Amino acid sequence: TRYSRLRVIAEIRHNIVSSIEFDRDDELFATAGVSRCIKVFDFSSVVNEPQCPIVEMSTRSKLSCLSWNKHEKNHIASSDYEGIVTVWDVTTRQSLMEYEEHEKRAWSVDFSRTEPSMLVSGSDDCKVKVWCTRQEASVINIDMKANICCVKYNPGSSNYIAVGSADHHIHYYDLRNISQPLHVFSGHKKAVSYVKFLSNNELASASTDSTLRLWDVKDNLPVRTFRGHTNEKNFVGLTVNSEYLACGSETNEVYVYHKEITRPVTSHRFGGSYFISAVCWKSDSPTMLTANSQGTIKVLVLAA
Amino acid sequence: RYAVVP
């Protein structure tokens, strides 16, 4: 009841944007995708102005994902279609680390919130790699049996990662003993394209079966399935906060779900054949960043 | 093909 619409409060008119992410203070955000350019914008400027990035970093390969460091304000990691995982400093524009062990496209990178020098990546090479920014070689390698589409650290401990796999399952690992996952969550009928935590115990996933799912990683239980959007092919984005899930759709629409309700609380038509390609909440607030396959960026806000 | 899930 609280919200029925998404209001557009800003738009940057444009190339697919595969990732849009806020820095540790929700002050800057970065975008990246097929154009081989990591662009950094000032959020307040975008909201207030009638819009140029403050930093642009050219890359050798198409980008699949970004993750800002949670301690070092100025550091951001990228994964690319060559398999390289790069840590960048947005003030100097330099690559700080270039991790080159993946043999195929890396789809995901995630910096840990609680051990901020640690970052994890997953790849079409079927490996999960854990890296430490002070070391050139990977610290942990998990050999899996299928392409890895997303890896995410638990927000409360760097010992746990969720792995979304093309085998249709979420593999939840304790990195202190990688012999077997703690649990493998089955329920999706197609590849699991995203995993994101609402809290220490609540995990959400997206899949090309046109569903989102909510899972309890304390008691290893399925919770809820969310339906309404169309997602049979593309990476269309998933972002969650403590209460809400948002995802893209192949209908060029953003969908929002409350975690307790299986059908959308609202949706927004972006304004064919376009798809939403990236979404990111501004922490626990009703404000979110969104981008689509044309490269348009919008700042949206849930509203009554 | 870009941004296509395996």
Residue numbers in the entry:
A (entry chain A): 351 to 364, 372 to 407, 411 to 631, 643 to 675
B (entry chain B): 406 to 411
Direct quotes from the study:
COP1 regulates gene expression and plays a central role as a repressor of photomorphogenesis by directly modulating the stability of transcription factors that control the expression of light‐regulated genes.
The WD40 domains of human and Arabidopsis COP1 directly interact with VP‐containing peptides (Uljon et al, 2016). Such a VP peptide motif can be found in the UVR8 C‐terminus that is not part of the UV‐B‐sensing β‐propeller domain (Kliebenstein et al, 2002; Rizzini et al, 2011; Christie et al, 2012; Wu et al, 2012), but is essential for UV‐B signaling (Cloix et al, 2012; Yin et al, 2015). We find that both peptides bind COP1 with micromolar affinity and with HY539–48 binding ~ 8 times stronger than UVR8406–413. Structural superposition of the two complexes (r.m.s.d. is ~ 0.2 Å comparing 149 corresponding Cα atoms) reveals an overall conserved mode of VP peptide binding (r.m.s.d is ~ 1.2 Å comparing six corresponding Cα atoms), with the central VP residues making hydrophobic interactions with COP1Trp467 and COP1Phe595 (buried surface area is ~ 500 Å2 in COP1). COP1Lys422 and COP1Tyr441 form hydrogen bonds and salt bridges with either UVR8Tyr407 or HY5Arg41, both being anchored to the COP1 WD40 core, as previously seen for the corresponding TRIB1 Gln356 residue in the COP1–TRIB1 peptide complex (Uljon et al, 2016). Mutation of COP1Trp467 to alanine disrupts binding of COP1 to either UVR8‐ or HY5‐derived peptides.
